[PDB]
Amino acid sequence: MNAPDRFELFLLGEGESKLKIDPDTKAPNAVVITFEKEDHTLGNLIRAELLNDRKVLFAAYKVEHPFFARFKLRIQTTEGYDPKDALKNACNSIINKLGALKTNFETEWNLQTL
Amino acid sequence: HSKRDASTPLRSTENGIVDQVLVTTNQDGLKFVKVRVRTTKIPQIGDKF
Amino acid sequence: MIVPVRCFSCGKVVGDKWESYLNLLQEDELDEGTALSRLGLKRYCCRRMILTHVDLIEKFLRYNP
Amino acid sequence: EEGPQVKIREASKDNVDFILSNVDLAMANSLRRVMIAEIPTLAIDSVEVETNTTVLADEFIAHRLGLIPLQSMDIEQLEYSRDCFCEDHCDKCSVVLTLQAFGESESTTNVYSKDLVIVSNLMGRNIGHPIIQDKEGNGVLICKLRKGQELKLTCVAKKGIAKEHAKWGPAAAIEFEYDPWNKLKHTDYWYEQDSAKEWPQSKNCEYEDPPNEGDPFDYKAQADTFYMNVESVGSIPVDQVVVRGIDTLQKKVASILLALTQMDQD
Amino acid sequence: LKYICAECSSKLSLSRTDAVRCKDCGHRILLKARTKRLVQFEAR
Ligand SMILES: [Zn+2]
Ligand SMILES: [Zn+2]
Numbered sequence: 435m436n437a438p439d440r441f442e443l444f445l446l447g448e449g450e451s452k453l454k455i456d457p458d459t460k461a462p463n464a465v466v467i468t469f470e471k472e473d474h475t476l477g478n479l480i481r482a483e484l485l486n487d488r489k490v491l492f493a494a495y496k497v498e499h500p501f502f503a504r505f506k507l508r509i510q511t512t513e514g515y516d517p518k519d520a521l522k523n524a525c526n527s528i529i530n531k532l533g534a535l536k537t538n539f540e541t542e543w544n545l546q547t548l
Numbered sequence: 549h550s551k552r553d554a555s556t557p558l559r560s561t562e563n564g565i566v567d568q569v570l571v572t573t574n575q576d577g578l579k580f581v582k583v584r585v586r587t588t589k590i591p592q593i594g595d596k597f
Numbered sequence: 598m599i600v601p602v603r604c605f606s607c608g609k610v611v612g613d614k615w616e617s618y619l620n621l622l623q624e625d626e627l628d629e630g631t632a633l634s635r636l637g638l639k640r641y642c643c644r645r646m647i648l649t650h651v652d653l654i655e656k657f658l659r660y661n662p
Numbered sequence: 663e664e665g666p667q668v669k670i671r672e673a674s675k676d677n678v679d680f681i682l683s684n685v686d687l688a689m690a691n692s693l694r695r696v697m698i699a700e701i702p703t704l705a706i707d708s709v710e711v712e713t714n715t716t717v718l719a720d721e722f723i724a725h726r727l728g729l730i731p732l733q734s735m736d737i738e739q740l741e742y743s744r745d746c747f748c749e750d751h752c753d754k755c756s757v758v759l760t761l762q763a764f765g766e767s768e769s770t771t772n773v774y775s776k777d778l779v780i781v782s783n784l785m786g787r788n789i790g791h792p793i794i795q796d797k798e799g800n801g802v803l804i805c806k807l808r809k810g811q812e813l814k815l816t817c818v819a820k821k822g823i824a825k826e827h828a829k830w831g832p833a834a835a836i837e838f839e840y841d842p843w844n845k846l847k848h849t850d851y852w853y854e855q856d857s858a859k860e861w862p863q864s865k866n867c868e869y870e871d872p873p874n875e876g877d878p879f880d881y882k883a884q885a886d887t888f889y890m891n892v893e894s895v896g897s898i899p900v901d902q903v904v905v906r907g908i909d910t911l912q913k914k915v916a917s918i919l920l921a922l923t924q925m926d927q928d
Numbered sequence: 929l930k931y932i933c934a935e936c937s938s939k940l941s942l943s944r945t946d947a948v949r950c951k952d953c954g955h956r957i958l959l960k961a962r963t964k965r966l967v968q969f970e971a972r
């Protein structure tokens with residue numbers, strides 16, 4: 435009746451951009467990025483990978499409401515270090531780890547029976 | 549305009565599919581009809597359990 | 598009605614295991630637990646899904662229309 | 663390789679029991695989530711009913727058809743109907759399979775998933791074929807016809823995500839457990855007398871070292887070893903379930919990276 | 929249009945000014961036949 439379409443969980447609406455980067459007014463050298471059509475699956479991973487970078491002061495994600503598939507990610511890095519680069523490094527690290535994991539799982543799969 | 553309308557409308561808030569239509573004369577020889585409409589209801593936010 | 602195709606909880610297919618279950622009950626003369634075990638229903642959600650089901654379609658087919 | 667490590671403990675057509683080593687908790691969890699939901703699969707999305715004199719309702723049967731596991735091997739060279747430049751659907755996006763059943767014998771005439779017949783042109787791709795893990799080779803019991811009851815319909819199956827509907831779910835139950843000895847103390851066990859005697863001991867306890875009472879609490883330890891068991895439904899092989907899970911997660915990360923690359927436009 | 933009797937497998941086609949009863953039966957319970965214009969179902 436008033437239930438929203440399912441594909442609105444992963445399909446970007448009319449005019450809706452994927453990432454919304456906004457300058458944080460609270461703490462200096464901080465940023466809040468709005469992820470659209472994404473849930474905890476991406477947010478938790480990215481946030482957990484941003485805490486590995488020792489040049490990142492703050493990193494936290496949140497889903498403001500379960501009705502809508504979107505989450506905000508706040509990042510604060512040290513001076514002389516753009517947070518977008520921290521996000522990029524985190525993402526690339528994730529991709530590399532997943533690639534290695536895939537390769538290892540494949541090699542380990544080839545050595546099995548039944 | 550020699551006829552008045554006495555048509556029956558589907559429920560304003562409901563919807564679905566016409567399941568089965570029955571046409572039969574009455575005991576007094578009156579042609580009357582029962583129309584059964586089917587709607588599948590799926591558990592939604594607010595349904596009582 | 599009829600045996601549900603898949604388990605509500607996890608999602609394992611169970612609709613292909615109904616007749617096999619019935620046979621395991623009447624042919625091999627097993628109890629419900631073992632019959633459910635042999636069909637690969639280890640999790641009690643699917644085990645429930647088959648054990649709890651009542652096949653009402655067999656009574657429905659008794660009508661001629 | 664150089665990163666996370668896998669150790670396949672058990673392997674079969676339906677299940678894969680393995681151990682993830684050198685991994686963050688969030689990556690394991692996200693992998694589980696992706697494997698559960700975000701993985702492409704072919705399933706019946708549209709059902710056109712011509713005649714239906716069976717007991718079951720139309721959308722009832724349609725719903726049952728939706729949950730039928732279909733072959734989603736070459737699903738990656740199939741396309742979303744929302745993306746294809748055709749009208750409604752075609753052979754590049756959807757797979758059409760018919761179903762004609764009729765009561766013949768005096769006995770109950772069962773309608774299975776094997777009775778589904780592919781009509782559309784597969785043009786080489788391994789797709790659309792209904793998975794039959796049944797022993798007699800019947801498959802999913804769809805319906806039951808009496809004597810003169812008929813079920814004539816057509817099914818258009820489209821590529822979909824389990825996030826949109828659980829019928830596109832390539833996996834069933836994914837077993838997941840880290841630290842069987844609670845050495846990380848992520849769980850405060852409930853008890854009445856003895857905490858250890860009341861709570862059953864996990865199998866995975868055979869793969870880790872028990873704590874020493876003389877040893878204090880390790881506060882600097884994280885979660886590295888994860889015990890998983892991925893179970894498939896049949897639409898996609900287990901190895902391909904976890905592999906395409908990884909590929910999907912990685913890909914949707916790469917989409918964010920690409921978005922960051924594109925946001926540099928004036 | 930056409931109809932179908934209830935307690936038998938017949939196929940009456942008696943339109944208006946006819947109605948009840950049935951061809952070779954005697955009962956006045958008449959159901960209406962299924963439409964030819966097919967309806968789709970989002971198998972969900
Ligand atoms: Zn289950
Ligand atoms: Zn197409």
Ligand SMILES: [Zn+2]
Binds near residue numbers: 933951952
């Ligand atoms: Zn008659």
